[PDB]
Amino acid sequence: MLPKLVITHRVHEEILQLLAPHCELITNQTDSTLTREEILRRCRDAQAMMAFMPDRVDADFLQACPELRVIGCALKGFDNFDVDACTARGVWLTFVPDLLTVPTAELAIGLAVGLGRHLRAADAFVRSGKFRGWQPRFYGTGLDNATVGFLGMGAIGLAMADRLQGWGATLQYHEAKALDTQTEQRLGLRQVACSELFASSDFILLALPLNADTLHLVNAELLALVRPGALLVNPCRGSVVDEAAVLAALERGQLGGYAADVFEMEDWARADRPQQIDPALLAHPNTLFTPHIGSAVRAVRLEIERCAAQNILQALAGERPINAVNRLP
Amino acid sequence: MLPKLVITHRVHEEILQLLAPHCELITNQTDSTLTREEILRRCRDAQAMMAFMPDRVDADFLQACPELRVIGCALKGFDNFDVDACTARGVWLTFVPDLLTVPTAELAIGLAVGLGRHLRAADAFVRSGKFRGWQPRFYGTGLDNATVGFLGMGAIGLAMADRLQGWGATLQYHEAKALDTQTEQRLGLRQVACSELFASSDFILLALPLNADTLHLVNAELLALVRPGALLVNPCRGSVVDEAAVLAALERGQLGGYAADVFEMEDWARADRPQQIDPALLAHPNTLFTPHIGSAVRAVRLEIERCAAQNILQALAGERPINAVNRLP
Ligand SMILES: NC(=O)c1ccc[n+]([C@@H]2O[C@H](COP(=O)([O-])OP(=O)(O)OC[C@H]3O[C@@H](n4cnc5c(N)ncnc54)[C@H](O)[C@@H]3O)[C@@H](O)[C@H]2O)c1
């Protein structure tokens, strides 16, 4: 027989045909996400698992599945997966380090432009059949001669920076880990204090992970700093901002706009998460939203799927998985 | 008696204070487009006019306004203004050659991202309140590794090519007047014929003016060459494309999407234009629209208005306007 691989969400059939001659598969080829108890059942005696953004794994889980050996995750942010427990149980935990970067970088830029140029309303105005030609309205904010501040300058921060090269903006960032001079210089990046980043940027592009330090980093106090009218764009994790503090900053018109691909309600790790995005936030005019689609480009998705599956075949064939997050003897 | 200046749309208070010493102002300080009869009535004894997108000037307009010395257009595309009739009447026609370029290029790239990533629908999905966490949906097209084809490579075509430099795309173009070798090279642009452009680009961005030769240049036959799912972005003029053929191509699924800032119904000089945007186009899910807001950036609008004024003032003082479109004795 063969090792038992659970796959919690739908993948390309091509991936199944590469995984089949080495594993028996317990798939879920739908557009629906299966309940927490249902998954544990499926994994009970599974050796391998392919996990995705809705999946949530703690100490309890791992204990229910003692035949497990590898969780192959098809994502960058593993904040919903307890790596420490995985390590202590001899369980591999792999991620996808690079492939999510660019498609997310592209979307983030689009959201900056769309937010700045009032695109949701503009398009709604055209579709309302009342367009009778140009009128002096929808006056928005462009990138040319603006200060773009980045918070975090890892993969996505850098990818965004590369993409804003010919846009005539002034590029600054705040890192927890500074770059060398060759890169700062060659991207025209200028490092600043966090407070300073907020009080001076017209655009604020977030590119940091969710962890102990980053939860609600963007608070009521740091939002009191921004230039009245600045635009906040969040393509990383919801909980790095306080959405309630953001709503208020919007309502008093200190914050010119908020855009986001991610939300607090997605972050199952901290039980105290909001159960929804605030109706008042969704109803706000100065917003642009997408439903965690940063990596939803179909050629990439296939490559992401392929990578996560290779990690699994590597782990199961005995070997060390090229993209393992943790270390194992 | 100071020379009479008619301004057809609302301008910044600062431009009025700029002109008011030199001439008497007949203003339209409302958000509204006036009737042609009202414009004719106001301009009948005017020495100058500041024109905008909704304005159209032919020989009949000029015959009825014999005192006109200058028409200062606050725009780039002067297709609605009969240049030759102006010349023959000894009226200066001026435009704004560079200020509209960058905000329109920014918007065009925003339209390309937004269309490729189903942004309108994605946002409507999040506002609906149905978002419960990642699903493998709203799958779309990215720029990385796509072939982006440019029809025209003048001001806006070049500002878009500059702005796509860090984006991992393969750039091609067709022109009536080719770039020099060194500009092409720097930007990584390949020069192709028009049918090849249409046959082999995943994104097609229009950057040409409207004239006799470009009227419905993007017609049924040319569209019949695209790769199934090709995306088309029009930031230039509506009537360079046939909107009926575009719609037919969307409906059969050969064109993957159409995004536009401009529409055939705006091209006033065309007597046979559609009067509205076809409701079936406005209903099509694979679309993204803006109400001619290409230069609707706050700081820039002021600058555009100022360029037209300066041109108006130069002509009224007997000079050749810096940005004259024509040449008078
Ligand atoms: N929307 C999407 O589809 C999508 C896709 C990929 C990743 N993401 C999210 O975005 C996050 C960023 O991804 P990435 O590839 O850039 O991660 P990365 O690990 O390459 O870089 C994150 C950077 O943030 C920096 N950082 C940490 N704390 C900081 C602080 N207080 N101030 C400034 N910088 C700080 C780190 O030094 C690190 O280099 C991911 O962890 C994930 O949560 C979202």
Ligand SMILES: NC(=O)c1ccc[n+]([C@@H]2O[C@H](COP(=O)([O-])OP(=O)(O)OC[C@H]3O[C@@H](n4cnc5c(N)ncnc54)[C@H](O)[C@@H]3O)[C@@H](O)[C@H]2O)c1
């Ligand atoms: N959406 C907006 O708000 C907005 C703003 C500014 C301009 N525009 C429109 O876009 C047009 C182009 O803008 P620009 O500033 O780039 O103009 P431009 O005059 O600098 O460049 C247009 C280019 O198109 C080329 N061209 C002409 N016929 C061609 C053909 N058959 N094939 C390929 N190329 C051809 C010309 O050689 C020229 O280089 C303007 O004429 C105007 O109508 C729209």
Ligand SMILES: O=S([O-])[O-]
């Ligand atoms: O890490 S991402 O897939 O949110």
Ligand SMILES: O=S([O-])[O-]
């Ligand atoms: O030249 S136009 O499109 O304002």
